[PDB]
Design a protein around this nucleic acid. Structure first.
Ligand SMILES: [Mn+2]
Ligand SMILES: [Mn+2]
Ligand SMILES: [Mn+2]
Ligand SMILES: [Mn+2]
Lengths: 163, 163
DNA sequence: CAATCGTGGGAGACCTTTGGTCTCCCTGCAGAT
DNA sequence: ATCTGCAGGGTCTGGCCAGACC
DNA sequence: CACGATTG
């Protein structure tokens, strides 16, 4: 009954579903660092691992993480950060005792009927609100689509269905 | 007394130096996976974690990892893998109780006088053989330059000097 | 703070800082000795 | 196996093609 | 997706 979902990008989130139906969602911790004399956001390694140590999810809990698949038209910094966020999350999840199952974005979108949307991030927040109504106040901003994708990944791995 | 050096690429290595002067060097564990219907080498996350947790180095031991600096002329997959390997190693080292200090490749090269070499991989192997003569049999192949790079990073953090 | 937009990008360490100069790692294939 | 050369590249799923996505 | 802006 324990399922973890991870949206790994810099505005992403981690969702935890418990066997009693309750859910948690945490924004991905980040820090500001200096790269090439400008400011960049990067995931906070220590806060991520400290977040995972304090979860009540037992070892062997499956973590469903979105498969890294950046676009060819994305720049090389987008490719680096997609890879960096992917490896940092996977290593943190494996070291915390969790079994990592990568899920393509096409898989959970087709599962919830979210393919070919004009507003995919808004539809994600709507679908996660319907699946997790106690998280509806945590999904009202446009920036909360990372929270929704983490919830939908965990909802996919748990086998929940929309009404 | 205890210093760890990490060369994070797919042919890289991790070197561990003990306060009695002895040394160990392990090739980076990897697996073959399928990406876009071809075979790719990716770092073996679970084997890296259990390698770090089998070390006798106490928690708080500083792990010097080569700083990520892919070239602008490198392709977007090289940027992805450089980022992925960097984040996978950093999260693995932090979760195992080690403190991570990134070191630019120019830093330990200048400290050992290896800059502007026409055969830099050969020179790293010869420099590591002189610093760690019980690893001379483990540095005889050209592919062993990742073992040398990890040994030299660890030698930089320990303050060793060449004769 | 929160949202929107347009394009896809290096980064780093000294030298003798206040910018300039110069340096450095790879991946992913194919083929050959 | 081990080394060399060279240019810098998507990847995925639902069934080689088609069409989808961060 | 990232990055480096601009918008109120
Ligand atoms: Mn995502
Ligand atoms: Mn996201
Ligand atoms: Mn290296
Ligand atoms: Mn290397």
């Amino acid at each position: 009954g324990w399922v973890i979902g991870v949206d790994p990008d810099i505005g992403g989130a981690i969702a935890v579903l418990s066997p009693d139906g309750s859910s948690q969602v945490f924004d991905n911790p980040f820090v500001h660092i200096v790269v090439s004399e400008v400011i960049r956001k990067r995931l906070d390694t220590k806060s991520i691992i400290q977040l995972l140590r304090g979860l009540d999810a037992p070892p062997g809990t499956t973590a469903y993480i979105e498969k890294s698949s950046p676009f060819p038209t994305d720049g090389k910094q987008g490719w680096w950060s997609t890879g960096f966020s992917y490896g940092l999350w996977i290593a943190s999840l494996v070291a915390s005792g969790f079994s990592v199952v990568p899920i393509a974005s096409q898989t959970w979108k087709a599962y919830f009927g979210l393919m070919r949307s004009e507003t995919p991030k808004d539809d994600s927040r709507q679908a996660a609100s319907i699946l997790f109504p106690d998280k509806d106040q945590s999904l009202k901003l446009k920036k909360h689509h990372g929270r929704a994708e983490a919830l939908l990944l965990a909802a996919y791995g748990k086998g929940l269905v929309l009404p």
